[PDB]
Structures are given as structure tokens and as C-alpha cells.
Structure 1
């Protein structure tokens, strides 16, 4: 996707408006010097009181900033003069378990957390293929981490046999988050 923010010259998103999809060192060249309202459609962004991204800063998040003092957190902060999108570094651990081989059918997506019961999460189907984007996981045949263990690491598993399962049945999954070396 593309970062999207729109600054308005007046309050309550009125008057002239300018759309920004990248970094802006000087805002007077957009037709809006003293911004009155800001609509953030895809961010986040960081704004600065001076040109060329200097001075006091303020972070914009997705939402509506209808007033001139909405995004500031200190009264002595001057008007918006420069703005740029933030390249957020946020890592997560994701594993996707599919009902049919070759990553088709119904799927369940797990992010970071352990799932002791697949049935409680609304997934009562089989598990024939697994895609691990990140993290180290262990799958189990039965709820509560019972039954045969399946170490699931970063990679693709086109078939249940590819991660050691005789039949395509997985009902619980936990994540290994600790490591006493390296």
C-alpha cells in the first residue's frame, strides 16, 4: 500500500486540501502553510515544527485531527512545517494452518500467542498443510498440547506427512519463545 495523509488549510477538514504520499521538507509549497486539520488515511507519520524535519516533533496515526492543536502535545509547539511517513519496525510470529494440502481450504492464522484448543478458536477441520512465516512452534494432535509433537519451523509443509503427522489432525499449538544459547 501507499502512505496517505491529507492536510487542510482550515479547521474541521474544510477549505483547500493537499494530499501527501511521501516525505515533505517544506509545507508552504503545497498551498497550506498553517495546517488547520489533518486526515491520516495510511500511516503513521511524524511531523515537525520546522522545515527539513527539525525541531519539536509529533506523531500522526490513522484517524481524524480536526483542530490545529489536535496533534500537538505541548502548547509551545509551532505550526506544522514538515512531514514524513514512519517506517515502523514491528515483528510478529505467524503460522498458518490449512485444511487441505497445498495450502487450500479453510485456514487458521495464529500470531504470537499459544492456542491450547483449535476447536475453541472456531476451527474443527483437519490440518493438512502448514505455512510458517516466522517463529518456532510445536503442534499437537489433541487439545492441551497432548499427543504427538510436531516441530513447525519457518517454511512450507505441503502435506501432513511433511511435518511428521500420520493423519491431518492438529488441535493445539504453542510457541517456543526462550533460548539459552546464541
Structure 2
């Protein structure tokens, strides 16, 4: 289906998602000046978002996340109800480290997208093709030449690498990947 370019969330009316609801797509510090008045139920189609008990954002919050929230009890283990007054999307910080290898130079064709997780045989994660291009989004990676990080070593830090010509290889042969994980200087 279509992939949202922003947070979504349809706080309802009759609970159980029955009837009469409004979709809010970004901060909304109140809820009367909303099609709705009292937080009926909640449907989250892309989050996460963080609530509040007191409009203008203060009070006992709650963290809603993709899924269905069928009724008041539903987003408060607290049994402390009096619904939804503030609704802000959580703009979550998340730290991944990605190197993405490419089939043919110029970063096109079949790729092998790896993250944090280190990989020894590219041949076993299903990639089989030669490796000619690479775009290092983050982390410090050290791509070997055979499986079990053995043979020829190549350092691969932040920056796209278009050819072995600029990523120091003879045969565009990287069987394995390793992430450097620690410094001490």
C-alpha cells in the first residue's frame, strides 16, 4: 500500500471504532476544536505518538503505537481515565548503522543492505553477485574478500564508493562484512 510521509492517527467517538471519528496528522494541543470532544477510542496507522490528560500537553501521558486501541482502559494500565487532551507525534531518535553494497558500479542493480548486524558470507544471506559499488550511510565497516572475513581487507567509512578504483579492490569481490564497533582513543 501507500507509505505515509507523516504521522497518522484517527481518535474516534463511539468506542470500538464505531461511528464518528477524526484523523489528526500532527501536533494538536486540544480536542474540542476537533470533530471530536472526548477521546472515544484510538486507531494509529503510523506512529508512534504521545498523549496527555491535560490539554496544552500536561498531565498523565501515554504512548500509543501502531495497532488498535479499543477503549479508554486501552492505553492506561493505570485505570486512570478522563481521556485524551493533547496529541503530539513522537519524532523518535533511532540509531542504525548501514553499509549497502551494490551489484554493478555506480550503486545500481542488485544490492545487499546490511545494518549493525555483521555478515560473514554474503553468499549465505542470499546475495551471490559480484560487488562493485557501495554507499556507507553510517558506522565503521571493514569488508573482506572471502567468507568468514578473510583474505583482502577494505575499510569503508561514510561516503559513497563508486568503483574498486576508489574503494581499493582488484576483483570486485567482497564476500563478507564486519562493523568496527569500538574506539578507545
TM-score with structure 1 setting the length: 0.96
Which whole-Å CA distance do the structure 2 matches of 1:147 and 1:10 have between them?
65
Which whole-Å CA distance do the structure 2 matches of 1:89 and 1:97 have between them?
25
| Partner of residue 124, structure 2 | 120
Where 1:138 maps in the other structure, the secondary structure is strand
Gaps of 5+ in 2: none
| Partner of residue 28, structure 1 | 32
- Superposed CA deviations along residues 119-174 of structure 1, whole A, max 9, x for unmatched, are 11001110000110001000011000100100000001111221111011100000
Which whole-Å CA distance do the structure 1 matches of 2:150 and 2:14 have between them?
62
| Partner of residue 82, structure 2 | 78
Where 1:98 maps in the other structure, the secondary structure is strand
- Superposed CA deviations along residues 49-77 of structure 1, whole A, max 9, x for unmatched, are 11111000001101111222111120124
List structure 1 runs of 4+ shifted beyond 3 angstroms.
none
Which whole-Å CA distance do the structure 1 matches of 2:149 and 2:92 have between them?
34
Which whole-Å CA distance do the structure 1 matches of 2:178 and 2:133 have between them?
17
1:97 aligns with 2:92: no
Which whole-Å CA distance do the structure 2 matches of 1:131 and 1:124 have between them?
19
Instruction: Give the aligned CA root-mean-square deviation in angstroms.
Output: 0.9
Deviation at 1:10, TM superposition (A): 1.1
Which structure shows the higher strand fraction? 1
Which whole-Å CA distance do the structure 2 matches of 1:73 and 1:82 have between them?
19
- Superposed CA deviations along residues 83-124 of structure 1, whole A, max 9, x for unmatched, are 100110111100100010101110010010110111110011
| Partner of residue 48, structure 2 | 44
Kept in 2, the 8 Å contact 1:101–1:158? The answer is yes
Deviation at 1:82, TM superposition (A): 1.0
Aligned length: 181
